[model samples]
Target chain A: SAVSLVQAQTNARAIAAMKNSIQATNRAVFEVKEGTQRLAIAVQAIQDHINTIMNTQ
Target chain B: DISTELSKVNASLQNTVKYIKESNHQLQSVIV
Candidate 1:
């Protein structure tokens, strides 16, 4: 039926869009992981410096 | 066939969302 064909086409597009969205989300997740690791290192350094200052005082 | 394909798409999206949620939790922990 014609209606079925139209529905199928729409579904196909929807699926493709979802695939793209998922890919973007994956990239975002990777970026977040990398950023968090860097942030953790920086925070650790700051904490160490604060401890050193406290010990010195 | 279309319904099956749609289900696959839904499942993938759910997984991606879950990954994002986990990443957000890690970011929150870093801030805390």
Candidate 2:
């Protein structure tokens, strides 16, 4: 019975930790998606500039 | 991936419960 109680407590703690980690990961993915959008915009701006230079020459 | 993580945790909890139940059963067998 003591062992069972200990195991239950350990399992509960592990589950809580896993939940916290998943929440952190959710935040991380949001940040990554935001950064990817910014990168895409920068690449598009560079492409436009290259196209303008080609057209003028 | 989050779902998978949840599933893993759930599976672990389930296994622990099963272990406890088995232990109870073994104790009963020994007494019988």
Candidate 3:
């Protein structure tokens, strides 16, 4: 129990740190409704994500 | 041009993620 808890917390912190860095993405996209409101498109989310990621310069 | 664009976009993200994983000493320790 103790070892499991400790390792869980350790790994959690590592993942949380990365999630903090990536939170802006989740927040931005979550708030935007590409498919939830009007046309409900499902394709462009990942496409735009990486395209912008790569083209950022 | 549609599929072509998709290919380029797909490739970019693929390489970008791969590069970032091995990007730095800090990332190396955290990710690997």
Candidate 4:
């Protein structure tokens, strides 16, 4: 069945594409969350700096 | 239409990668 193999080839590509897409999405989510947490740390650093400056004055 | 379905998936994957690239760039710019 030539059509069988034909459709099968298309399905094969689809499966591989799905796997990579899922992986990329998962990694992106992780990095985005990590970045947000890092941002909070940056905010804290600024706040601490200002508190020290006010105390010194 | 298996072919059309595959095309859609491919397009979506490309869009996802592009979005990730742009997002990382923006995040770096903001953080730095």
Candidate 5:
């Protein structure tokens, strides 16, 4: 019974650690999504600027 | 209790790894 309890406790801890890791990963994905969107916008702006220069020339 | 908890943990780990790999691929796509 004591060993079962200990095993249960360890399993619970492992479960919690995995849950925390998933949460951290979700946050990372959110940040990466935001950064990628910003980067896309910036690149599009530069492309537009280049096209404008080429058209004028 | 044991099997359920273990299964949940395994699922969570898999999901996290999937996200990480997807992010890496997206980053590479952006770079190219």
Candidate 6:
């Protein structure tokens, strides 16, 4: 029945709270992905710099 | 017929009060 959905949708008063939680979890996931991407960039930059230095030396 | 319907409405309103109270209790529990 629509009663149950009505009750649930009505009961979800803290929509912000739920949305905030979901957003935080999503942000954390995105942050981790970005961190990995940054780490890869840093490693490649470091390798490129090292190769440049070694090749010149 | 009107009396019976009024009685039913009264009953429904009374039961709705009970339902409302139960709903308020659930809201309180969720708040806690």
Best TM-score among the predictions, by candidate number: 5
Q: Count the backbone clashes (under 3 Å) in each candidate.
A: 0, 0, 1, 0, 0, 0
lDDT of 1 by residue, A1-57 (tens): 899998788777666656665666676666556555555565676678778988689
Candidate 3's C-alpha runs over 4 A off are A1-57, B24-32
Model 6 residue runs over 4 Å out of place are: A1-10, A14-16, B1-32
Give the CA lDDT, 0 to 100, for residue B21 in model 2: 50
Native-to-model Cα distance after best TM-score fit, residue A48 in candidate 3, in Å: 18
Better of 2 and 4 by TM-score: 2
Better of 5 and 6 by lDDT: 5
The C-alpha interface RMSD of every prediction is 18.1, 16.2, 8.5, 17.9, 18.0, 24.5
Model 4, first chain, TM-score of 0.69
Report each candidate's C-alpha RMSD, comma-separated, in the order given: 17.9, 15.7, 13.5, 17.5, 17.7, 27.0
What DockQ score does model 6 reach against the true complex?
0.01
Q: Estimate each model's TM-score.
A: 0.52, 0.54, 0.29, 0.52, 0.57, 0.45
Clashing pairs for predicted structure model 1, backbone only:
none
Residue-level lDDT tens digits of model 3 in B1-32: 44554555555455545444433323334545
What's the lDDT of the predicted structure labeled candidate 6?
0.54
Candidate 5's displacement at residue B30, Å, is 34
List runs of model 1 lying over 4 Å from the truth: A52-54, B1-32
**Chain A TM-score of each candidate structure, as shown:** 0.73, 0.75, 0.34, 0.69, 0.81, 0.62
Query: Candidate 2: deviation at residue B7, Å?
Result: 38
Give per-residue CA lDDT, model 5, range A1-57, as digits (tens).
Answer: 999998788777666656665665676666556555555565676678778988689
Those runs of model 5 whose alpha carbons end farther than 4 Å from true positions after fitting are: B1-32
Against the hidden true structure, what lDDT does model 5 obtain? 0.60
CAPRI quality of model 3:
incorrect
Tens-digit per-residue lDDT, A1-57, candidate 6: 789987776558655445554554555555445545555565676678778978689
Model 4 alpha-carbon drift over 4 Å, by segment: B1-32
